[PDB]
């Protein structure tokens, strides 16, 4: 098996195993509405076996960055429908990544309200993008009832993604955002049904997954994880146990795939997660053609997602096939505004 062999995820046939990683780019129209510029960008990248969209918030309280899209209202649905129709016409496939940032936010995005979290524990560091440099606030710990409200926002978001014509949804369970905050012991000190045991810590992620399953069928739902707990001030007392429990429970549900941001190192727990899960495993983080092909050949992965190389190379799959040079990425325009550093990276000539 190589990167260029087709794979099925659930009942969706992909033409290759080169996956476009979910990538926040901050190019939405005011009101967090997907636009034609975004449609152009995704169309350019439609040769990907599957596109995982930029993280897309399921509610106004789940945003923490400027100009990132939502999926909670009809205006946003209409904007996304233009994106998915264009991707499909270009021969591509796309899942919407469902997001809630939890504590990783700032009151300026929330009309002065505090970000919400399982527990009132301030994340270290400064809010990205916000200027002047600001610390994160201490978040407000959610009431039990409010957590059910959040599950409903994910359910509605999943319904809205289906109306918008996506091929599936991926649950953002990674990178220190809301679901990951509940999952890990350092950030969750709750004593209701949503904290205080592994079963309880994983509960929110699984309730959101089950809601998505009702809308989509599990074989059109994926989950994103960050098992090294290395972004946004995370930390868990037994991550081998935590993430394999999640993997087992997701596998019981027959979900389409797990995609983990976890570069290869001796402490990679990906193999434990893959085995517990039993379904297609998508590795990610610092992979190149050679190491991706090596992981496929060794059975450590079923597909490989590429982030930065897809930012800079719309025709990444053709470039990989040809062992062609790759465009250099410009991190100064990963975020920010407009077409420069977004739709102006060239295709092979
Ligand atoms: C600019 C940028 C935006 C990203 N946005 C997201 C995101 O919205 N959701 C997510 O799960 N990961 C996001 N990531 C992480 C990437 O999906 C990926 O895990 C990371 O870039 C490592 O893979 P790579 O070495 O192939 O780039 C982002 C990364 C970058 C650089
Ligand atoms: C490293 C990282 C993030 N971070 O700053 O800790 C955040 C991401 N995100 O989803 O916004 C993604 C990241 N990543 O995969 O490299």
- Residue ranges and CATH numbers for the domains of the chain are 1-349 (3.20.20.70)
Q: Give the Å distances, CA to CA, from 20 to 58, 221, 240, 306.
A: 21, 16, 27, 5
Per DSSP, the three-state class of 126 is strand
Pairing of strands 7-9, 18-20: unpaired
State whether the beta carbon of 334 lies less than 6 angstroms from ligand 1: yes
Q: How far apart are CA 45 and CA 32, in angstroms?
A: 22
Listed in sequence order, the DSSP H helices in the chain are 36-44, 74-89, 144-163, 178-183, 198-216, 239-252, 270-277, 289-297, 308-312, 316-321
Name 140's bridge partners.
116
How far apart are the CA of 175 and the centre of ligand 2, in A?
Answer: 6
In 100-180 the beta strands, taken as DSSP E runs, fall at 116-117, 140-141, 168-172
CB-based burial, 307-318: b 16+ in 10 Å, e otherwise: bebbbbbbbbbe
Residue closest to 314 by CA, chosen among 77, 42, 96, 115: 42
Method: X-ray
Residue 70 to residue 84: CA distance in whole angstroms: 15
Q: Let me know how long the chain is.
A: 349
Q: Give the C-alpha distances (Å, rounded to integers) separating 66 from 28, 33, 94, 108, 130.
A: 9, 12, 23, 10, 9
Resolution in A: 1.5
Angle at 87 between CA 286 and CA 18, to 5 degrees: 25
List the beta bridge partners of residue 308. none
Q: Which of 52, 63, 187, 232 is the pocket-test mutation for ligand 2 (most atoms within 8 Å of CB)?
A: 232
| Distance from chain centroid for Cα 171 | 7
* Angle in degrees, CA 87, 209, 202, rounded to 5: 135
In whole angstroms, what is the distance from residue 245 CA to residue 256 CA?
Answer: 17
With residue 303 as reference, give the H or E element that holds it.
Answer: strand 303-306
CB 113 within 8 A of CB 59: no
Distance separating alpha carbons of residues 108 and 119, to the nearest angstrom: 20
Could you tell me if 97 and 170 are in contact, meaning their C-beta atoms sit under 8 angstroms apart? yes
Q: Which residues are annotated as a binding site for FMN?
A: 22, 24, 55, 97, 284, 286, 307-308
How remote is the C-alpha of 305 from its chain's centroid?
Answer: 11
143 Cβ contact partners less than 8 Å away, ≥ 6 residues apart: none
Number of alpha carbons in the 13 Å side-chain half-sphere of residue 253: 28
């Amino acid at each position: 098996t190589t990167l260029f062999d087709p794979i099925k995820l659930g009942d969706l046939q992909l033409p290759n195993r080169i996956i476009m990683a979910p990538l926040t780019r901050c190019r939405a129209d005011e009101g967090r509405v997907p636009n034609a510029l975004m449609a152009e960008y995704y169309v350019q990248r439609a040769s990907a076996g599957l596109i995982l969209s930029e993280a897309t918030s399921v509610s106004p309280m789940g945003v923490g960055y400027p100009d990132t899209p939502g999926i909670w209202n009809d205006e946003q649905v209409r904007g996304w429908n233009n994106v998915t129709k264009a991707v499909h016409a270009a021969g591509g496939r796309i899942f919407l990544q469902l997001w809630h940032v939890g504590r990783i936010s700032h009151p300026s995005y929330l009309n002065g309200e505090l970000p919400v979290a399982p527990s009132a524990i301030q994340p270290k560091g400064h809010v990205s993008l916000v200027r002047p440099l600001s610390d994160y606030p201490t978040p407000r710990a959610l009431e039990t009832e409010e957590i059910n409200d959040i599950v409903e926002a994910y359910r509605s978001g999943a319904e809205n993604a289906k109306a918008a014509g996506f091929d599936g949804v991926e649950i953002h369970g990674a990178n220190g955002y809301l679901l990951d905050q509940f999952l890990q012991s350092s950030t969750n000190q709750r004593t209701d049904r949503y904290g205080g045991s592994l079963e309880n810590r994983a509960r929110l992620l699984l309730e959101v997954t089950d809601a998505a399953i009702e809308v989509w069928g599990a074989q059109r739902v994926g989950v994103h994880l960050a098992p090294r707990a290395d972004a946004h001030d995370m930390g868990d007392a037994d991550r081998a146990e935590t993430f394999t429990y999640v993997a087992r429970e997701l596998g019981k549900r027959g979900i389409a795939f797990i995609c983990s941001r976890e570069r290869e190192a001796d402490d990679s727990i990906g193999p434990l997660i893959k085995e517990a899960f039993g379904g297609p495993y998508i590795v990610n983080e610092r992979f190149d053609k050679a190491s991706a092909n090596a992981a496929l050949a060794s059975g450590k992965a079923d597909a490989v997602a590429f982030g930065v190389p897809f930012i800079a190379n719309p025709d990444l799959p053709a470039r990989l096939a040809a062992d062609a040079p790759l465009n250099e990425a410009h991190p100064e325009t990963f975020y920010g505004k407009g077409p420069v550093g977004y739709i102006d990276y060239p295709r092979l000539k």
